[PDB]
């Protein structure tokens, strides 16, 4: 019966916490995942409103004697808008990409991102690529815009100090995990992240509808 | 009389510094000071124009041998805007806030702000919270955007691209303390830097008028 | 005869190289050089589209035991608009410039810049300044904004975002070579970079026309 309220709150709850997150009120979220030679995981993880971006370097552990990275996963939430995703890559610690007199400033890789599901619902979105064996270290920087459900112009006379002001207040988080299997049951699992493993096995919680 | 010009000099240099700052020409600053365990004092103070925010991890020292946080300052210039003050947090090195999913991205703290005097002029604004002692670090990220006198959209076609170069023009400055009284004594009083103490006491300089 | 086609291409291809560059859709770049006591030479480099800028603090080596920064040579790519160049700079770790109530947050510094030349060709912008032999350190802040050919509102409703993202997008290197020789050798001449070294040589190349 329709008189269990406690199912359809149960209901709600769910519901609305999906659709807050899409809302301009709600976060998006990048993850750069860094594999290295050693079977470890390194994280980087921003989230802010109107936006997110992550820039970085990832090289060889110990001063180059260490494990390098080998290959690198970026996962939007849900919320992007997939064809404002940007990518600009160097393979070095030296400016990689060819010459700065003929470098486009980024790619857009919206189109190269696969869907991660769960139960048919869209939990995130990720691209994968690997590092060529050639180099020890790869800067890289990713930038993704939250879609906007409306019409809205939140780059406006009035609403553009506040995504000034969203630049501010955005949280960077920085992990490393010993294997993909402690990054799966004490990163992604118990904060409820979107992530596909070595596998292609698709991890996140439905919340829809 | 007033054919002491010597004192009607002296009158209008501190009054011309007050209102410099508090004109969209001058900087807004803040501070965050991350009080420890074993009494020393972490500092980190950024200054801009327009805007400034401050995004932090303040974890225990050694990796996690030694002292914890146990406490957070931050102090904001007179300059700044308190309804605009907003402020994320994060208990953990992990994303700590519930979920991203039901996260609003920041929470509007400025009416917790306690004005900082001195002589009846408000030389700063502060907001005091300690945490929980079952947390080993924070995460914290705060924002205030400049007093805008007039009706002037620093946001405007054209004035907008100035804003940005705030963004990079911003300083950053971290430093460590031994005690209170070192932070005081060494930062706070020769800056002419607004402050609360461990005992309620106000630190700054009157310059109006 | 211009039925060598093979040189007309040659001479398309570099001009090319030299046109997008100074395109919105090219790169704006800085260079921040930092001389050292010991001959090193530290080196920031940032390239990003629309604006570029950095924030560093350069800092006695070794927990203040070794060499020292001495002087500062800061270089733009020849597509940035030498009228938004701003810089703001402090000679400490604690927010140097007098006081914060008086701080005018930056100077117009573009009119110091001399230009690095190749065969008559700009190649880049530089101003060089000695650091007081009294200081350890130096905050250094500075910002360009890329020539805008037209009259084109990269700041508009729609293309705000896009500078934002610009932002995000924006990839830095630190590097720090042994002399000013290894320098040249291995970081400027290979990038293709403008350059003035000690002797007033300048270094890049022509692409033009």
Redesign the interface.
Same mark, same amino acid.
């Given at each position: 019966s329709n008189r269990d309220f406690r199912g359809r709150e149960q209901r709600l709850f769910n519901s609305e916490?999906?659709n807050?997150?899409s809302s301009l009120?709600?976060?998006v @979220?990048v993850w750069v995942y860094a594999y290295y030679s050693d079977g470890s995981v390194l994280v980087i993880?921003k989230?802010?409103?109107?936006?997110?971006?992550? @820039?970085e370097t990832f090289k060889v552990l110990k001063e180059g004697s260490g494990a390098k990275p080998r290959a690198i996963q970026i996962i939007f939430?849900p919320s992007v808008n997939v064809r404002?995703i940007? +990518?600009?890559k160097?393979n070095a610690?030296?400016?990689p990409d060819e010459?700065?007199?003929?470098? #486009?400033?980024?790619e857009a890789t919206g189109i190269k991102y696969r869907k991660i599901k769960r139960d048919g619902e869209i939990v995130g979105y990720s691209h994968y690529f690997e590092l060529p064996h050639e180099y020890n270290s790869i800067?890289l920087?990713?930038?993704g815009?939250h879609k906007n459900p409306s019409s809205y112009?939140?780059?406006?006379? #009035?609403n553009? +100090?506040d995504?000034?002001?969203?630049?501010?207040?955005?949280?960077?988080?920085?992990?490393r995990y010993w294997a993909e299997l402690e990054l799966v049951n004490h990163?992604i699992s118990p904060?409820?992240?979107p992530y596909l493993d070595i596998n292609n096995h698709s991890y996140g919680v439905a919340?829809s509808n």
């Open positions: 916490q999906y807050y997150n009120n709600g976060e @979220s993880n989230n802010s409103q109107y936006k997110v971006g992550i @820039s939430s404002t940007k +990518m600009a160097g610690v030296s400016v010459y700065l007199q003929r470098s #486009h400033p980024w800067s920087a990713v930038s815009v112009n939140v780059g406006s006379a #009035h553009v +100090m995504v000034f002001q969203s630049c501010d207040l955005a949280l960077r988080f920085c992990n990163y904060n409820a992240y919340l």
